[PDB]
């Protein structure tokens, strides 16, 4: 990745938001975030790691859409 810290930070931060969920099924939200971080990772090139991290970062922000 860009930073090994940053990805583990992102995985942490996303799961923290999951606790604050109100309407969305919390079991599914957790399952959906887990599998994403599994199958995508362990196999990528340096350049595309900059893109995939950013994809997660905009998920964190939730500016364009926030799941509740």
């Amino acid at each position: 990745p860009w930073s090994r810290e940053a990805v583990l930070s992102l995985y942490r931060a996303l799961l923290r938001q999951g606790r604050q969920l109100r309407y969305t099924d919390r079991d599914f939200y957790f399952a959906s975030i887990r599998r994403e971080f599994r199958k995508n990772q362990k196999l990528e090139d340096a350049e595309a790691r900059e893109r995939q991290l950013e994809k997660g970062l905009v998920f964190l922000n939730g500016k364009l859409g926030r799941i509740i």
Partner: protein
């Protein structure tokens, strides 16, 4: 007529009692000129999906305001995908199969940044407009 209004909290709880498999309720900002709230719910069988969709629309009419326009269910002929549009809420009834292939939640949470948009690249015509084998 007066009492409970049509909103997410009532609508979701209404879904849940028919064994809604997964629920994703998504806040959509005003710049995306479609809806206030996007909802995705899964189902067990084709006839189970009809059950839910038809209950939701039926209950809608009960609590519906007089001037509040009537709504139409979509895709009754369809096997796996059913959709119902309300005023400020949009709901998608699917099998787990179609959820795996559409990824509607991903599209709407992150717009231009999804994986499915990345694979596809825009095609440009060559300069001087000459093709070569």
């Amino acid at each position: 007529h007066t009492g409970p209004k049509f909103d997410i909290d009532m609508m979701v709880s209404l879904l849940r009692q028919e064994n809604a498999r997964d629920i994703c309720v998504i806040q959509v900002p005003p710049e995306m000129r479609y809806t206030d709230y996007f909802v995705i719910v899964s189902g067990t069988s084709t006839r189970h999906l009809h059950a839910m969709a038809f209950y939701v629309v039926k209950m809608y009419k009960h609590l519906k305001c007089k001037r509040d326009p009537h709504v139409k269910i979509e895709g009754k002929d369809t096997d796996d995908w059913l959709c119902v549009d309300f005023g400020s809420m949009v709901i998608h009834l699917m099998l787990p199969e179609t959820r795996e292939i559409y990824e509607l939640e991903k599209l709407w949470t992150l717009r231009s940044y999804d994986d499915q948009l990345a694979q596809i690249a825009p095609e440009t015509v060559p300069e001087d407009f000459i093709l070569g084998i």
